[PDB]
Amino acid sequence: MKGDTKVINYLNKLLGNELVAINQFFLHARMFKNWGLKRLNDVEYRESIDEMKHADRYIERILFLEGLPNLQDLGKLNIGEDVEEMLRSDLALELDGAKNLREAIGYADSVRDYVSRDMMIEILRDEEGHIDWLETELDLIQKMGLQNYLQAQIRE
């Protein structure tokens, strides 16, 4: 069906967020693996699967709405140079992405695009879990200090 123009615009924006997140995951996972940080690597990998699914859903919805994927400028990634900077950068991305997603959800709801709204609601639930994980690891880094946090990742 021909979708709402502004919904399709939101979906394109959100798809670009997902792609940026995937890009940043691709680098982080490998950095963590190189440092021996198995648990951080594994969480990054699992969350990347989620983000790919999100991106899949966006493209399918855009195409079903007779729109075409068309990305905004995705910008410069802030990769980070140490584990705290990396996770803090992820948190920044994830908080902005959740803000965008709430805006889109409200808008889709307001114009009776309930299928788009419901899709986005599911994605947001996943993103809130990503945020919770990040915030929790960053709180540990503050409590323990980064070096002590890194040393606690080392497996018996």
Added chain:
Amino acid sequence: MKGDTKVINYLNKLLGNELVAINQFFLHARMFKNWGLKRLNDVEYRESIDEMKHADRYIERILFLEGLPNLQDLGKLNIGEDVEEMLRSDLALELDGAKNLREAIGYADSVRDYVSRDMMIEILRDEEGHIDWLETELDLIQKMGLQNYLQAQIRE
């Protein structure tokens, strides 16, 4: 070992090219699948595996050289609105990426970073194959006209 600063810079640039290409593949493959274009979908998917491997190699080399992945601004993708525009956009990316890669190969060679040079030489061989495919499909589109080309993709 501590690598050459400018080599690491090149590797970062080339990694960003790979990420852009992967992003564009993620969209194109799904567009093609939605249009029923099985053979184009399949080639895009196979080439995306190559690009991911390339990106893997770059990150590993940067890390082995004691550098850190650090991406340039990757910009706005030109997705295209029809199959010719999509493949032409891919060709543009791939030609620029090959130009960058020859520059880096020459530089790495010149400063005796032969391991980096040899890695890039392998990647370039793959990229030249991507270029050949694109150019060949685009020549068919010119010869046949886009619509007749699209109709010839439809399976008996």
